[PDB]
């Protein structure tokens, strides 16, 4: 039953300047059936298939260099080394303002206790976290 | 396309558990 299948959708906190902290947005509708947000990470409560996804927005006023490397990744940690599940790399520069989105999505086999994270490499360029478009979610199929 | 859709979905405050699933796997349709 879909009611029993866990779900989690967290969104970046905009007031946490300089980093990418996840917050549940007081989601009392997302019937998390075990999934928890601990240490900025999602912990899987059950073994099975899960849809893991995440999106980040980057923003910059002008190009200082030409080697602006923005990356977004999703990792898994089981027995307390992290393993990358999904990753992406963008380079917007070759003061004109710019933006670059990075969405990640995939289906993976998880076991109970896994700890999923979604990390970036330039939290300074993170922006638009108040529109709900910077997110990180889990759906048990 | 998918990206902006999941985001929008995540913000709808009058969406049930059942409904949020449906529209995520909707976006992913
Ligand atoms: N679709």
Q: What is the DSSP letter of A126?
A: B
Interface test with B, best of A9, A10, A131 (most B CBs within 10 A): A9
DSSP bridge partners of A61: A97
CB A140 within 8 A of CB A49: yes
Of A134, A53, A17, A102, nearest to B11 by C-alpha is: A134
Q: What is the DSSP letter of B29?
A: -
Domain ranges of chain A: 1-141
Q: Can you read off the two tokens belonging to residue A60?
A: 């910059």
| Residue linked to tokens 């080697």 | A67
Q: Can you read off the two tokens belonging to residue B10?
A: 């995540």
Backbone angles phi, psi at A127, to 5 degrees: -150, 180
Chain B residues 1-29 within an 8 A CB cutoff of chain A: 2-4, 6-8, 10-11, 13, 15-18, 20-22, 24-25, 28
């Amino acid at each position: 039953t879909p009611s029993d299948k866990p779900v989690a959708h967290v969104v970046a906190n905009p007031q946490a300047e300089g980093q990418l902290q996840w917050l549940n947005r007081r989601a009392n509708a997302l019937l998390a059936n075990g999934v928890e947000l601990r240490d900025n990470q999602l912990v899987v409560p059950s073994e099975g298939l899960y849809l893991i996804y995440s999106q980040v927005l980057f923003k910059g006023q002008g190009c200082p260099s030409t080697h602006v490397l923005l990356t977004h990744t999703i990792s898994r940690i089981a027995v307390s080394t992290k393993v990358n599940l999904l990753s992406a790399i963008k380079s917007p520069c070759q003061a004109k303002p710019w933006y670059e989105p990075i969405y990640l999505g995939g289906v993976f086999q998880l076991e109970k206790g896994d700890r999923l994270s979604a990390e970036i490499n330039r939290p300074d360029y993170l922006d638009f976290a108040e529109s709900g478009q910077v997110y990180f979610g889990i759906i048990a199929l | 396309x998918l990206g902006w859709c999941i985001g929008e979905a995540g913000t709808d405050p009058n969406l049930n558990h059942a409904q949020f699933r449906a529209k995520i796997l909707x976006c992913w349709x």
